[PDB]
DNA sequence: GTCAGGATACTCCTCAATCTACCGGGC
DNA sequence: GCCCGGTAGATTGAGGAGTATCCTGAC
């Protein structure tokens, strides 16, 4: 009962056709639930007939208590290992298990289910005690090394020359194991031994980079290509050696390097691609194929499909970009027209690993998922726009009804669970452990959903199931604390780190368990905890930082980086930049604090000296979340850009007084000089007579010039900006205090007086005008603001309250403005 | 019958930036 | 009781390893 396609596929081995038909009923009885695909996969190998006959003969005894091999495991071994591996396993059933080797059946299957399984199994059985005792190697490492094609040679090479690489090259056994855990490990190890001094001395390459390069499939060829092409790539093409080793640290890096060398000028001249884009595209598996596909299909996708080159690069910037590009070219118009999905969604689906599988699954499953199960196409694209989208989508298709009618979960919860990397694992773990968690430990379904909705939720859920009782009982933590700890990316590592490190971090450095939970409740909390352990005494005795400050610095996503950056940059910022350590702690106690600290170090002198900004303003700007982009944007706008943009950016920092007095009329020149003097004195800075003469010359020589008095003391001068209020952007309100004499004093909403913080109008322009009149004894003046909502309903009373006795004020809202509510007023009103 | 190399596909772990919904004192 | 600000979460994107499976050439 085989189809034509199955017979054609199995006809690769001519002798397998006869044996399968004669005894077709025989394997079914011996191998229950054996699907035709498994049979055709087993029988299509070099010894399909022999392997099938051996399985049929031996499966009666291969299911014994010493092995207890499942049917799927037997089929996999027959397909991969062959007749030799099956015979070796059967002949040594009692040798592998129940022996000083101490090998589980899963490890035995993994070693056997590989090319040359018999030789690898014999080598393991002969050399496991030797490598365990003489070299002190973990049996897991030996199994991992031997679980590869030609693993016997790699194991023998490791046993032969582990001490040589350990001593004469200073390489840890872990690096050797990682290098030898790939195909052709013996050749890679020999190449490393013969080449490490040459690549480390003449080429000046870090041994870690060489180890990383050699820790891939075919590392010997990659190392040889690197040695042969490093000077050429560094000189002719101007490629950084770090970039070269990053490109060559993938599977088949030799082909990628050759393609890059052969096609860099072509893509950089006849295609417009930058070297960085080509490097990024080539920094993935199958780089040669991706580069060739990009070069061949760039005009086709750019013109016929209307795709920007950046989108093509991003699609090809992943593993297997050739298949994704071909699938996009084949399936863009038919899927877009017949389903109406935006091309951005199609790009987002294929912008990950295995995008072709996700795209095909979406094309197949959109109608049925949207019809029977009721998912929105946006939800489907959200689930498919992740690593392994095919697995998550097929799992949703298979599993949604039983999850939504038996376990009492909503479809949106399932959509959230399945919309993460490895969503199939999370879905299956939920289906397997939801009753257990909701019964044995009392966790609510919402907590389980929250735990399972991160990258690697299966490991987090299993870790919770294993470690929740012991953490909750021995360590005295409420289950809510463990749920909070585990509900993060890579939460298994954080949970194991907490279980390991709670007693020492409590009884050694005197940290409250709540502090440990706060440190560990963020992504990458294991690194934060280890860094706190290693650094806390250093920050205590060597710099006088309290443990509370260390915990506050570490209680963020980038806690390790922030702590290391604080340790490295505390003396320089505290001595050569004039920053108090408290300001450093405040800057670092934010998400991405390492970048903020480095940006402060880099841009403090240029901002403080060239543009005349106080260090306090820089610290305040950098003390907010995401302060690095804010500082970079401020530097960009201050160094170049529009005059009005620079003026607004400078005034928005606060403490800056601008003036647009006009004409000569020496009297108001004197008054303006007096006002500048008063502001400088209020800032504690003496402006001296030379700057008085300078500003007087500027005022007398530039008609209609607007000044700016920063808190530092520098007087920025702008030639011309505008004589009218700017457009209202919805959050920033601008005002000008026009006196009777003629002086115009600019104002901007926000950054109000801290003294009246409890007052709700703190920051409005009318309040700033009132305080300015009160301080400088201004009798009468008017205001003009460009708020389109009119004056606020609080200001009409509060600003009149702040006015001095006997003082007058006027505010004029714009004519085009309309009041938004009864509180607001959209007409001229005189206050007193 | 093995050994070495290349190509996809998938999972998990750490980081940095931005968005928003709950709380809270004043009206 | 009803806000609008503050801010502590809560997405959202990104990169970097680590893991697993399959196909091909050469003896
Ligand atoms: Zn106001």
Sheet bearing A744-748, strands edge to edge: A744-748, A734-739, A781-785, A809-812, A829-831
User: Longest C-alpha distance within chain A, in Å?
Assistant: 117
| A351 strand C contact, CB < 7 Å | yes
Q: How far is the CA of A798 from the centre of ligand 1 (A)?
A: 9
| A420 strand B contact, CB < 7 Å | no
Query: What's the Å distance between residue A788 CA and nucleotide B24 C1'?
Result: 28
Q: Residue for token digits 């029977």?
A: A372
- Write out which nucleotides of chain C lie closer than 7 A to a protein Cβ: 4, 9-10, 14-18, 20, 22-23
> In this structure, what token pair is assigned to residue A306?
């209307």
CB atoms under 10 Å from CB of A796, counted, come to: 17
Backbone angles phi, psi at A831, to 5 degrees: -115, 160
Angle at A752 between CA A751 and CA A755, to 5 degrees: 135
Nearest CA to A326 among A304, A366, A355?
A355
DSSP one-letter string for A344-398: HHHHHHHSSTTHHHHHHHHHHHHHHHHHTS---HHHHHHHHSSTTHHHHHHHHHH
Contact A442, A469 (CB under 8 A): no
Which 3 state secondary structure label does DSSP give A102?
coil
Hey, CA dihedral for A594, A596, A600, A606, is it positive or negative? positive
| A85 strand B contact, CB < 7 Å | yes
* Nearest residue (CA) to C1' of B6: A252
A248-284 burial, b at 16+ Cβ within 10 Å, e below that, comes to bbbbbbbbbbbbbbebbeebeeebebebebbbbbbbb
| A184 strand B contact, CB < 7 Å | yes
| A109 strand C contact, CB < 7 Å | no
A803-832 burial, b at 16+ Cβ within 10 Å, e below that, comes to beeebebbbebeeebebeeeebbbeeeebe
Which residues 6+ apart lie within 8 Å of A303 measured at CB?
Answer: none
* Angle in degrees, 0-180, between the axes of helices A377-384 and A389-405, rounded to the nearest 10: 130
CB atoms under 10 Å from CB of A705, counted, come to: 18
Query: What's the Å distance between residue A290 CA and nucleotide B8 C1'?
Result: 12
Which residues 6+ apart lie within 8 Å of A395 measured at CB?
Answer: A418, A423, A424, A427, A428
| A734 strand B contact, CB < 7 Å | no
Closest nucleotide to A457, Cα to C1': B12
Nearest CA to A786 among A768, A800, A767, A765?
A765
Contact A531, A565 (CB under 8 A): no
Closest nucleotide to A760, Cα to C1': B26
Q: Residue for token digits 């884009």?
A: A277
Helix or strand (DSSP H, E) at A535: helix A525-541
> In this structure, what token pair is assigned to residue A281?
């595209």
Provide the 8-state DSSP code for A804: P
Query: What's the Å distance between residue A741 CA and nucleotide B15 C1'?
Result: 57
Query: What's the Å distance between residue A626 CA and nucleotide B19 C1'?
Result: 13
Question: Distance (Å, rounded) from C-alpha A61 to C-alpha A63?
Answer: 5
Question: Distance (Å, rounded) from C-alpha A595 to C-alpha A627?
Answer: 8
Query: What's the Å distance between residue A750 CA and nucleotide B23 C1'?
Result: 23
CB atoms under 10 Å from CB of A723, counted, come to: 10
Q: How far is the CA of A782 from the centre of ligand 1 (A)?
A: 16
A53-75 burial, b at 16+ Cβ within 10 Å, e below that, comes to bbbbebbeebeeebbebeeebbb
Helix or strand (DSSP H, E) at A784: strand A781-785
Which chain A residues 284-313 have CB under 7 A to strand C?
Answer: none
Contact A519, A529 (CB under 8 A): yes
Q: What is the resolution of this structure in A?
A: 3.2
H helix runs in A625-756, sequence order? 627-639, 643-652, 666-682, 688-701
Which 3 state secondary structure label does DSSP give A591?
coil
Count of H-run helices and E-run strands, chain A = 45, 5
Contact A251, A238 (CB under 8 A): no
Which residues 6+ apart lie within 8 Å of A359 measured at CB?
Answer: A324, A327, A328, A331, A335, A346, A349, A350, A384
Question: Distance (Å, rounded) from C-alpha A790 to C-alpha A812?
Answer: 9
* Angle in degrees, 0-180, between the axes of helices A105-112 and A139-146, rounded to the nearest 10: 30
DSSP one-letter string for A477-525: --HHHHHHHHSSTTHHHHHHHHHHHHHHHHHTT---HHHHHHHHSSTTH
Helix or strand (DSSP H, E) at A736: strand A734-739
Contact A390, A408 (CB under 8 A): no
> In this structure, what token pair is assigned to residue A85?
């591996």
Which 3 state secondary structure label does DSSP give A169?
coil
Backbone angles phi, psi at A641, to 5 degrees: 140, -170
Q: How far is the CA of A796 from the centre of ligand 1 (A)?
A: 8
| A80 strand B contact, CB < 7 Å | no
Contact A736, A766 (CB under 8 A): no
Contact A515, A509 (CB under 8 A): no
Q: Residue for token digits 């700007």?
A: A621
Provide the 8-state DSSP code for A756: G
**Helix-, strand-, coil-residue percentages of chain A, each rounded to 5:** 65, 5, 30
Q: What 3 state SS string does A706-724 have?
A: ECCECCCCCECCECCCCCC
Question: Distance (Å, rounded) from C-alpha A708 to C-alpha A715?
Answer: 6
Q: Residue for token digits 């690489």?
A: A165
Contact A500, A471 (CB under 8 A): no
Half-sphere exposure of A308 (CA within 13 A, CB side): 6
Question: Distance (Å, rounded) from C-alpha A261 to C-alpha A283?
Answer: 14
| A316 strand C contact, CB < 7 Å | no
Provide the 8-state DSSP code for A98: S
Contact A496, A529 (CB under 8 A): no
Which 3 state secondary structure label does DSSP give A47?
coil
Backbone angles phi, psi at A341, to 5 degrees: -70, 140
**Which residue(s) pair with A812 in the sheet?**
A784
Decide the pairing of beta strands A809-812 and A829-831.
antiparallel
Question: Distance (Å, rounded) from C-alpha A392 to C-alpha A58?
Answer: 37
The Cα-based distances of A157 to A163, A165, A767 in angstroms read 11, 11, 81
> In this structure, what token pair is assigned to residue A606?
């240029």
Closest nucleotide to A323, Cα to C1': B8
> In this structure, what token pair is assigned to residue A71?
């049917």
Which 3 state secondary structure label does DSSP give A675?
helix
The Cα-based distances of A36 to A10, A45, A75 in angstroms read 11, 15, 11
Which chain A residues 456-475 have CB under 7 A to strand B?
Answer: 456-459
| A355 strand B contact, CB < 7 Å | yes
Q: How far is the CA of A830 from the centre of ligand 1 (A)?
A: 15
* Nearest residue (CA) to C1' of C7: A625
A164 Cα distance to chain centroid: 39
H helix runs in A11-112, sequence order? 16-22, 24-30, 36-43, 48-62, 71-80, 83-91, 93-96, 105-112
Question: Distance (Å, rounded) from C-alpha A610 to C-alpha A515?
Answer: 43
CB atoms under 10 Å from CB of A779, counted, come to: 11
| A625 strand C contact, CB < 7 Å | yes
| A263 strand C contact, CB < 7 Å | no
Question: Distance (Å, rounded) from C-alpha A317 to C-alpha A293?
Answer: 12
Query: What's the Å distance between residue A597 CA and nucleotide C2 C1'?
Result: 42
| A199 strand B contact, CB < 7 Å | no
Provide the 8-state DSSP code for A680: H
Nearest CA to A223 among A236, A197, A238, A240?
A197
Question: Distance (Å, rounded) from C-alpha A429 to C-alpha A410?
Answer: 17
Contact A750, A679 (CB under 8 A): no
Nearest CA to A594 among A530, A690, A528?
A528
Contact A584, A573 (CB under 8 A): yes
**Which residue(s) pair with A734 in the sheet?**
A748
Closest nucleotide to A798, Cα to C1': B27
Question: Distance (Å, rounded) from C-alpha A829 to C-alpha A278?
Answer: 64
Contact A267, A239 (CB under 8 A): no
* Nearest residue (CA) to C1' of C14: A352
Q: How far is the CA of A765 from the centre of ligand 1 (A)?
A: 7
Decide the pairing of beta strands A781-785 and A744-748.
unpaired
End-to-end CA distance of chain A: 100
Contact A30, A65 (CB under 8 A): no
Question: Distance (Å, rounded) from C-alpha A65 to C-alpha A54?
Answer: 20
CB atoms under 10 Å from CB of A633, counted, come to: 11
Contact A492, A463 (CB under 8 A): yes
Radius of gyration of chain A from its Cα atoms, rounded to whole angstroms: 36
A627 Cα distance to chain centroid: 18
Query: What's the Å distance between residue A555 CA and nucleotide C19 C1'?
Result: 31
Angle at A521 between CA A516 and CA A525, to 5 degrees: 80
Which 3 state secondary structure label does DSSP give A681?
helix
| A592 strand B contact, CB < 7 Å | yes
Question: Distance (Å, rounded) from C-alpha A398 to C-alpha A523?
Answer: 31
Provide the 8-state DSSP code for A162: H
Backbone angles phi, psi at A709, to 5 degrees: -110, 95
Nearest CA to A568 among A542, A586, A591, A549?
A542
| A150 strand B contact, CB < 7 Å | yes
Q: How far is the CA of A731 from the centre of ligand 1 (A)?
A: 12
Which 3 state secondary structure label does DSSP give A825?
strand
Question: Distance (Å, rounded) from C-alpha A54 to C-alpha A43?
Answer: 12
CB atoms under 10 Å from CB of A114, counted, come to: 22
């Amino acid at each position: 009962g085989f189809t034509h396609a199955h017979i054609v596929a199995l006809s690769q081995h001519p002798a397998a056709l006869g044996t399968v038909a004669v005894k077709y009923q025989d394997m079914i009885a011996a191998l229950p639930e054996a699907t035709h695909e498994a049979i055709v996969g087993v029988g299509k190998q070099w010894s399909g007939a022999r392997a099938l006959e051996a399985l049929l003969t031996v499966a009666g005894e291969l299911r014994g208590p010493p092995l207890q091999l499942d049917t799927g495991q037997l089929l996999k071994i027959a397909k991969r290992g062959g007749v030799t591996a099956v015979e070796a396993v059967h002949a040594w059933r009692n040798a592998l298990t129940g022996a000083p080797l101490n090998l589980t059946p899963e490890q035995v299957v993994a070693i056997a289910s590989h090319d040359g399984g018999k030789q690898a199994l014999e080598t393991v059985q002969r050399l496991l005690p030797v490598l365990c005792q003489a070299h002190g190697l973990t049996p897991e490492q030996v199994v991992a090394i031997a679980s590869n094609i030609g693993g016997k040679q790699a194991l023998e090479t490791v046993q032969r020359l582990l001490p040589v690489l350990c001593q004469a090259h200073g390489l840890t056994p872990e690096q050797v194991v990682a290098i030898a855990s790939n195909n052709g490990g013996k050749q890679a190890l020999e190449t490393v031994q013969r080449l490490l001094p040459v690549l480390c001395q003449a080429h000046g390459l870090t041994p870690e980079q060489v180890v990383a390069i050699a820790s891939n499939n075919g590392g010997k060829q990659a190392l040889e290509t690197v040695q042969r092409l490093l000077p050429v790539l560094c000189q002719a093409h101007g490629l950084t050696p770090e970039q070269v080793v990053a490109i060559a640290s993938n599977i088949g890096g030799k082909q990628a390097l050759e393609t890059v060398q052969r096609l860099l000028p072509v893509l950089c001249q006849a295609h417009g691609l930058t070297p960085e884009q080509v490097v990024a595209i080539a920094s993935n598996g199958g780089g040669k194929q991706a580069l060739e596909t990009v070069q061949r299909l760039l005009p086709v996708l750019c013109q016929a499909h209307g795709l920007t080159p950046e989108q093509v690069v991003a699609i090809a910037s992943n593993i297997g970009g050739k298949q994704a590009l071909e699938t996009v070219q084949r399936l863009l118009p038919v899927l877009c027209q017949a389903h109406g999905l935006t091309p951005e969604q199609v790009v987002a689906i294929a912008s990950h690993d295995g995008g072709k599988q996700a795209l095909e699954t979406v094309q197949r499953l959109l109608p049925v998922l949207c019809q029977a199960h009721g998912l929105t196409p946006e939800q489907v694209v959200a689930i498919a726009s992740n690593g392994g989208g095919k697995q998550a989508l097929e799992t949703v298709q298979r599993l949604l009804p039983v999850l939504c009618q038996a376990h009492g979960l909503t479809p949106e919860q399932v959509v959230a669970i399945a919309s993460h990397d490895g969503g199939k694992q999370a879905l299956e773990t939920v289906q397997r452990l939801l009753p257990v968690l909701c019964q044995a430990h009392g966790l609510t379904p919402e907590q389980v959903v929250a735990i399972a909705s991160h990258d690697g939720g299966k490991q987090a859920l299993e870790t919770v199931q294993r470690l929740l009782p012991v953490l909750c009982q021995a360590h005295g933590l409420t289950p809510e604390q463990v749920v909070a700890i585990a509900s993060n990316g890579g939460g298994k590592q954080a949970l194991e780190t907490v279980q390991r490190l709670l007693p020492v971090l409590c009884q050694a450095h005197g940290l409250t368990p709540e502090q440990v939970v706060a440190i560990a409740s963020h992504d990458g909390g294991k690194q934060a905890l280890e860094t706190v352990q290693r650094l806390l005494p250093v920050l205590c005795q060597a710099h006088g930082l309290t443990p509370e400050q260390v915990v506050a610095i570490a209680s963020n996503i980038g806690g390790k980086q922030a702590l290391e950056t604080v340790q490295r940059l505390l003396p320089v910022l505290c001595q050569a930049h004039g920053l108090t350590p408290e300001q450093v702690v405040a800057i670092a106690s934010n998400i991405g604090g390492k970048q903020a600290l480095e940006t402060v170090q880099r841009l403090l002198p240029v901002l403080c000296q060239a543009h005349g900004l106080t260090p306090e303003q820089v610290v305040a700007i950098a003390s907010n979340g995401g302060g690095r982009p804010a500082l970079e944007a401020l530097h960009a706008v201050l160094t170049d850009g529009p005059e009005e943009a620079k003026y607004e950016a400078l005034m928005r920092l606060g403490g800056a007084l601008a003036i647009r007095i006009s004409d000569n009329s020496e009297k108001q020149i004197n008054t303006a000089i007096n006002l500048i003097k008063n502001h400088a004195k209020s800032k504690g800075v003496e402006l001296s007579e030379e700057d008085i003469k300078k500003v007087e010359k500027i005022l007398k020589e530039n008609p209609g010039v607007v000044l700016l008095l920063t808190p530092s003391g520098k007087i920025h001068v702008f030639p011309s900006i505008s004589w009218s209020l700017p457009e209202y952007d919805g959050t920033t309100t601008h005002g000008v205090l026009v006196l009777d004499d003629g002086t115009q004093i600019g104002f901007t909403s926000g950054n109000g007086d801290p003294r009246y913080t409890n007052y709700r109008n703190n920051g409005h322009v009318a309040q700033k005008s009132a305080l300015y009149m009160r301080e400088n004894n201004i009798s009468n003046a008017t205001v003009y603001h460009n708020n389109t909502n009119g004056t606020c309903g609080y200001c009409n009373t509060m600003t009149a309250t702040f006015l001095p006795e006997g003082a007058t004020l006027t505010v004029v809202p714009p004519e085009n403005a309309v009041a938004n509510n009864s509180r607001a007023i959209d007409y001229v009103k005189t206050y007193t």
